[PDB]
Design brief:
- It is classed as membrane protein.
- Keywords: membrane protein.
- The assembly is tetrameric.
- KirBac1.1 mutant - I131C.
- Chains A, B, C, D are Inward rectifier potassium channel.
- The structure is a homotetramer of 301-residue chains.
- With 301 residues, chain A is α+β, with helices and mostly antiparallel strands.
- Chain A folds into 2 domains: 111 residues, Helix Hairpins (Orthogonal Bundle); 123 residues, G protein-activated inward rectifier potassium channel 1 (Immunoglobulin-like, Sandwich), CATH 2.60.40.1400.
- In chain A, 29% of the residues lie in helices and 15% in strands.
- Chain A contains 6 helices and 7 strands; from the N terminus they run H-H-H-H-E-E-E-E-H-E-H-E-E.
- The first copy, chain A, has a 4-stranded antiparallel β-sheet with strand order 4-3-6-7. Chain A has a 3-stranded antiparallel β-sheet with strand order 1-2-5.
- In chain A, strand 1 and strand 2 form a beta hairpin.
- At the A-B interface, helix 2, helix 3 and helix 4 of A face helix 4, strand 6 and strand 7 of B.
């Protein structure tokens, strides 16, 4: 009966999104593609490695199916080899290449029991090559499988519109962080992208912006549900941030969150940018506003 | 006959906790749960991944049992398939589905020897699917096993009450670090959580506190048994730290310790927070106090 | 129909280098060698580990061939053992050691089906040792395979000559970054190596140079195609950088780029140094210059 | 014919230590022990994990032998089970438990061919349990094997006595770095341990020392063979470093070196401390002194 840990016995957690589950996934910067990145498209030699990338993302149901497809294709190739013209391997329950398929599945996977017919050395060599390849394939598939597990998932990026509301008599901006996975130790850094008035982009196009203020007062260590926030009044590029000026430039607000996961420690980072028109007025100050009386932590979308 | 390394030939090390071993484990922030974090409960789609989490923590005896249970269940499902209605696979030592169980165990695991009866193609297809699934399962189990080993253990968090005692004519606070595993290179950072007097929590609720002082004079590199300590007299929020004031706010002292393990290098971190009432008066100054005359390092609880 | 992601449906990406693909790879700091580093050559005990290194780099086609070669060699050694002089294992389809080869391949890899002849205990012991070794070998090969995948590729180093051109009425230097793989979050640090005029190298030979300026105004977070740049006019060693002076010293410009890959997070770094004569005059200011009207991102060499 | 890379075609690299190879290894902080650390000895529950540690260090020849020993022991236990009293499994080439050993090796490892005798269900259950355990064991052994490879080796710590020699008319201290493996990107930090004159150790015993000066002018990025160095003349605790004073305290000089390996990126660190009497006078200024005329890099001990 701990204060927070008793929470899971509460009502269903489906409030994040029950209905959208049946709807397709959030594909916006992660749509099905053979590219790793839109800029990465330039490398042409990458075609081999593209498969690696492909096998890494959609792989939950697709990988198993893909592996099965590869199995069938590879096995049939073997069957064709069986028909090559050396003394054939027969005496399998199904006559013809079907029989070849039947014993060869055992070879390209594990190893055949009563299919004791390596009568011809040519057939044997073919089978031997298949054995080597098949065990190699198993290692490859297992390696890929582990690699997929190794890849962590960063749902921490979330998606929410920035809100510019006053706080402490000072104009400020606020961003919603995500607690979707094991988020317990993240820290964040804010980057902004403003274009100068004179930025015809013939010179130092795209002025990089250092806005440490979003995280400066906000250093988030008790990350169980922190919000990031900067102050406008100080000396910062954001002073002149009126909407029209922001619109003129390609004002982009970028926030990155990264830290250990408490789980096997990997530094998981997240990238999320919001457009200048994604900023919202102070009217959003109403916030989530807990509906349950008392200090309670609730997650609703 | 080195100075410290001769120590293991001394008396039993059981002083950390011999009797408590039979008692249940320290479940306080790590109780058996299907949640990853109390906040993480909100994500509902996580149910699949919950199993991953589950298989990662309690897994020492439970994993093997679980795997066996899965084996039995999966195998019996196969047996049911054997009874599907195609020409059945018989001619196994035990008649009936028991025989099916007997040969199928070989298929869903490794591969059957004298159970050379893939007489019917329908039976064969069923067996083939089982073979594919079984080898996949082996890869999955091995992957999970390695992943578990990959997860490091951080006993370094320990548990001890803070002590506010005077030192060098200056009021200070002290925290006991843990040397439970391979702790040789950790470094630490201190975070505090104070509530403002005016913190009705309608504004910037929960004032984050930067208290680098705990580690500031204490940078711990010779980590073989270091204690962390801050100074109150300087300008710090802790100046006004009288107990009544601390009680009013939800004064929380948080200390994190992290560094390489000398072992395959992973950055292992630890999180441990102590309540404001977990702070103890200066009377704790007596310390462990070595009982063995001379400079000796002893670990007793 | 996103702004950048629609790009892959454009023309072929082969512009990075279609013809050079048939030409040998860029071997300059990575030529075929048994050394790990030119300085690493000094360690002689490393000969065993040299193989590890060797198996890690060229391994795409070479590893499979090497493994096959090892298989043949190891298997033949087993065959020799078969001929040791204990009662021989015969009754294999091919008489003689060929038969030994035939059944032994099954033993040193997976396990033999109808080769049920462990008639002599001496033969059996030999086979048993082979079984143990073979399964160990499989584990070793799979481990090496995964390790290779674990190794990331850093094409991000690229190769381009530095350009010293004026910008904003201030003399500056510019370096081309690479987007060849998944480069999305890199950051960079600049190091320089100048020799003092008086540097007879009898004292503090080789004055290390701190040139943070290359990245100082350039902190690259929107890394989709950033260029690094320092300023000469400020107080920096580069003020006196006239070509003759640079030539006198062994002026070396070193830039390192590193950051998370968004992929399983590993910190991938890159090292690339350019000679003092690799610096080019301001005439290179023409830049790539997009040929497609409008703001477009194109990758051409 | 590159400048440094042609070096390996030179004379033998054995100069690091040809004869000492036959001599036992440098066991000083890494002697055969069941402890992870001298302080780690305190945890008693660690006994299980001690084996993990043990299997990780000496494992090059020992692991294979250990595994074989475990195989024999586990297999014999199975044989005992065969003799349990259920209808026995006979009809193996060797009569008695020897036969049991013979077929059981196939079960606890891979899977038996002509040993088609699971005649009794009790025998079968025993064999089945063995199959499950054996495959699990294989996974465990492979996991351990990969884990060992994952562990990097840091020979970079080296061992050399500090030298306090004058440089640039300023008293300085110098330390020899090691290039033994793939050392290309390390950086270093210096820590010192001095005891105060008044340090009866009743107060803040052991004054931690921040000596960033060793690396301050020395930031080592061109790490192909850099030496670390601090300056005494500035304000530093080292000003009063006369030998007698150092002797009074337990002056310890600690230097840590860490950075990416260019190899699969792991941050490999190294810890090495030197006693106050390990410091040497300025007479060591003679240095290695290259014997080969011209600027050449040679590694001799």
């Amino acid at each position: 009966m701990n204060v927070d840990p008793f929470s899971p016995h509460s009502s269903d957690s489906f409030a994040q999104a029950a209905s959208p589950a049946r709807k397709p996934p959030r594909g916006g910067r992660r749509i099905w593609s053979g590219t790793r990145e839109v800029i990465a498209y330039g490398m042409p030699a990458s075609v081999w490695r593209d498969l690696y990338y492909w096998a890494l993302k959609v792989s939950w149901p697709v990988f198993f199916a893909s592996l099965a497809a590869l199995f069938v294709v590879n096995n049939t190739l073997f069957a064709l080899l069986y028909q090559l013209g050396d003394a054939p391997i027969a005496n399998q329950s199904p006559p013809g290449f079907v029989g070849a398929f039947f014993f060869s599945v055992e070879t390209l996977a594990t190893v055949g029991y009563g299919d004791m017919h390596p009568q011809t050395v040519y057939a044997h060599a073919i089978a031997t090559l298949e054995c080597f390849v098949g065990m190699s394939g198993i290692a490859l598939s297992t390696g890929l499988v582990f690699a997929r597990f190794a890849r962590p998932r960063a749902k921490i990026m979330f998606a929410r519109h920035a809100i510019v509301r006053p706080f402490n008599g000072r104009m400020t901006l606020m961003v919603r962080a995500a607690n979707a996975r094991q988020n317990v130790i993240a820290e964040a850094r804010a980057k902004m992208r403003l274009m100068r008035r004179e930025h015809s982009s013939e010179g130092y196009s795209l002025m990089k912006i250092h806005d440490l203020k979003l995280v400066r007062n906000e250093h988030p260590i008790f990350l169980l549900g922190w919000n990031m926030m900067h102050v406008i009044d100080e000396s910062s590029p954001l002073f002149g941030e009126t909407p029209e000026s922001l619109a003129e430039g390609r004002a982009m607000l970028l926030v990155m969150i990264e830290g250990s996961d408490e789980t096997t420690a990997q530094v998981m980072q997240a990238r999320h940018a919001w457009e200048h028109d994604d900023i919202r007025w102070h009217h959003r100050y109403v916030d989530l506003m807990s509906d349950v009386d008392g200090m309670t932590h609730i997650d609703y979308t």
